[PDB]
Amino acid sequence: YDKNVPSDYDGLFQKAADANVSYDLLRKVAWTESRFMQFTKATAKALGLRLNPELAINAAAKQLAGLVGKFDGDELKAALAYNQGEGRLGNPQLEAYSKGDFASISEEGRNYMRNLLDVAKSPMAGQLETFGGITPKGKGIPAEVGLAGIGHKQKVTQELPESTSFDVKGIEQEATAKPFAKDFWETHGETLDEYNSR
Amino acid sequence: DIPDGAKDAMKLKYLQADSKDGAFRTAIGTMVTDAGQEWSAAVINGKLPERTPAMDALRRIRNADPQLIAALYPDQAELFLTMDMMDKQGIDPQVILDADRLTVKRSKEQRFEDDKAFESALNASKAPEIARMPASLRESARKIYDSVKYRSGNESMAMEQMTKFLKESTYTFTGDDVDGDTVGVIPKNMMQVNSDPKSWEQGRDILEEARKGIIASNPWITNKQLTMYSQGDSIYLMDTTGQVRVRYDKELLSKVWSENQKKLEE
Amino acid sequence: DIPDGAKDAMKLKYLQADSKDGAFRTAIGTMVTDAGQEWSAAVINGKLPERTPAMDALRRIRNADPQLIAALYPDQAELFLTMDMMDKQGIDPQVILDADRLTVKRSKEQRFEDDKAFESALNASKAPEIARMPASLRESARKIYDSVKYRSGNES
């Protein structure tokens, strides 16, 4: 459903944002939330400090820098702390992630990690990539590679109807021809009264 | 890939061949309403805005087909015929904008009183250019009288000024014995044959040779006597039954005068 | 396979036997409106266009059944009776087109004044062809008086 071949403003910006983590991850963290950083929570915008690609990708790059730096070797832990903060909800999960107890992390953290480990690198990668296989030697299928092609096309196009103006041009009118008194004036140099006195 | 002037000849076929609410007579109705609102705003404030697109557009579509715009919206037609009759006399549009504001500030009773007062103070003048004016010239003259009587409080200067204006610019025709010795009134502007206005005199002769020339060919008339009338750019020497309509315009008078000048050297 | 003149005798039976909005009196109503708009445009501009299809068509359908067109649209009936009374005297239509333009540029008060003035300047003539004219001839004569008084300023 995604590839690294198509390039746009996203790949144009994260080339420097990763220099100010990883360009492959930062291109992928944004894609999953906002297709081509989508800090939707109002508190996340007041804490992270909007809809401007000059700082949005720069905000994610700063958080994902510390999140991938708080352990320096657990990049899947970083992606998890991103959409699952470390307050009152992520603490019970993040302490249950390192022990390999993925059955007790979340219904959303697993689905998030399972979508981004294909470009991210963690020591627990190959241990979650096989977390829920149908047989213990199997690989559990994440949400958007088992639900791949299932989708209906929107039967409403941004193409709009067109009306046109009743613009008909006929023939222009002659301007207000000079008054007969002024006509006689600037043609015979003397008014009408001065011409009849002779 | 059709001429740019042959497109009107079809959009207007649709506009004419439309119901009263169809989306053709409803997209042009916006031009009519914008022009009407503009004319009302001009009457009230006083000044005609330098930018009047709706009224100019309606005027072009009127010149393209007059029997259509006169039929669909029969008040813009009258406005534009008045503006035509003015602009063939130099009168700036301001005159109408000065006249109407004095007529719209009037109860329906006073309009009749003022109209009787005008028609009586006009059938009391001595020059026939004024005592006997056709309806068209009486409208174009009521406008001047009203503009003057609206600017300067003079009810009396207005009369002398419109009288002088009509005397310097018009000319009564006359024939054999006719009660009131006046048969039509044509402006001295629509009778020229050259670019200098004095040439009107020359353009007069042809008419007095044409009218007689018609009487010498159409004697069966009630009296050996026609009328005379100049609407728009034309001069109608009609009959009393309307059967001898004979139309001249500045082009035809100029051609006849040129050909006549080709009869003097020989 | 019916005579071409017996078809009118049935389309008109339908048109007469119709409600006021039915699609019979609504497809002919377009002829009436086009003719009315044409007559108004003629009064305003001055000239009667050489191409007047709506008014001619209404005139033919009037001659086919007069007590129907006079009943449905009772103003085209009057227009056409006036045009008939004129055309039996040579008077070109222009006369009406010269008369009405002087009557439509008139407030409702002046019409009464002018009509009294005419009827008094007519009961003052000495030949009885003029002092005592029927109503029909007085209309066809008011039209001539108005055409002349509208072309040449002479009220006299």
**Complete DSSP assignment for C62-103:** HHH-HHHHHHHSTTHHHHHHHHHHHHTTT--THHHHHHHHHH
A57 contacts A26 by C-beta, under 8 angstroms: yes
- For residue A178, what are the contacts with CB-CB under 8 A and spacing of at least 6? A186, B90
Here the tokens at position B20 are: 């009263």
Distance CA A60, CA A18 (A): 10
Distance CA B161, CA A178 (A): 18
Choose the closest CB to A176 out of B63, B65, B87.
B87
Tokens 């963690």 found at: A122
- For residue C98, what are the contacts with CB-CB under 8 A and spacing of at least 6? B238, B242, C46, C146, C147, C150, C151
- For residue A132, what are the contacts with CB-CB under 8 A and spacing of at least 6? A102, A140
Q: Do C150 and B134 touch (CB under 8 A)?
A: yes
Cα distances from A124 to residues A102, A129, B233, in angstroms, run: 10, 8, 98
Quick one: which of C45, A139, C8 has its CA closest to B68? C45
Q: Experimental method used, please?
A: cryo-EM
C144 contacts B240 by C-beta, under 8 angstroms: yes
Q: Do B67 and C49 touch (CB under 8 A)?
A: yes
B192 contacts B247 by C-beta, under 8 angstroms: no
Q: What is the CA radius of gyration of chain A?
A: 35
Quick one: which of C148, C139, C41, C132 has its CA closest to C82? C139
Query: In B118-241, at which residue ranges do the beta strands (DSSP E only) sit?
Result: 170-172, 185-187, 235-236
Tokens 């697109």 found at: B53
SS3 category, B185? strand
**Which value, to the nearest 10 degrees, does the dihedral of the CA atoms of residues C46, C50, C51, C54 take?**
60
Quick one: which of C97, C139, C138 has its CA closest to B238? C97
B227 contacts C152 by C-beta, under 8 angstroms: yes
Interface test with B, best of A165, A173, A197 (most B CBs within 10 A): A173
SS3 category, A5? coil
CB atoms within 10 A of CB A108: 12
CB atoms within 10 A of CB A194: 12
Based on the residue annotation, tell me whether A33 is a catalytic residue of this protein: yes
> Which residues, in sequence order, are bridge partners of residue C58?
none
- Whether the CB of A176 is below 8 Å from some CB of chain B: the reply is yes
Distance CA A109, CA A97 (A): 10
Mark whether B and C touch (3+ CB pairs within 8 Å): yes
Cα distances from C108 to residues A34, B106, C105, in angstroms, run: 74, 16, 10
Distance CA C48, CA C11 (A): 30
Cα distances from C85 to residues B203, B264, C101, in angstroms, run: 39, 49, 19
**Phi, then psi, of B229 in degrees rounded to 5:** -170, 140
B200 contacts B206 by C-beta, under 8 angstroms: no
Quick one: which of B212, B223, B216, B145 has its CA closest to B179? B223
Quick one: which of C110, C17, C146 has its CA closest to C71? C17
Left (φ > 0), alpha (ψ -120 to 50) or beta: where does A120 sit?
beta
Cα distances from B125 to residues B77, B162, B187, C39, in angstroms, run: 32, 12, 19, 36
> Which residues, in sequence order, are bridge partners of residue B172?
B185
* DSSP H or E run through B247: strand B247-248
Distance CA B128, CA B58 (A): 37
Beta strands B247-248 and B185-187, pairing class = unpaired
Beta strands B170-172 and B185-187, pairing class = antiparallel
Burial class from Cβ neighbours inside 10 Å (0-12, 13-18, 19+) for residue C65 reads: middle
Choose the closest CB to C151 out of B116, B139, B238.
B238
Distance CA C64, CA C79 (A): 16
The residues after which chain B has a C–N gap greater than 2.5 Å are none
At residue A146's C-alpha, the angle toward residues A145 and A147, to 5°, is: 90
CB atoms within 10 A of CB A182: 13
Cα distances from A55 to residues A8, A15, A20, in angstroms, run: 17, 14, 12
C154 contacts C148 by C-beta, under 8 angstroms: yes
Distance CA C79, CA C98 (A): 15
Cα distances from A88 to residues A93, A103, C54, C64, C134, in angstroms, run: 10, 19, 86, 96, 109
Q: With beta carbons under 8 A apart, name residues in chain B contacting C93.
A: 242
CA B162 to chain centre: 16
> Which of the 8 DSSP states describes residue C111?
H
Q: Do A180 and B168 touch (CB under 8 A)?
A: yes
Instruction: Note the resolution in Å, 1 decimal.
Output: 3.0
Closest CA of chain B from A161, distance in Å:
15
Here the tokens at position B110 are: 């006073």
Quick one: which of B166, B109, B112 has its CA closest to B134? B166
SS3 category, A165? coil
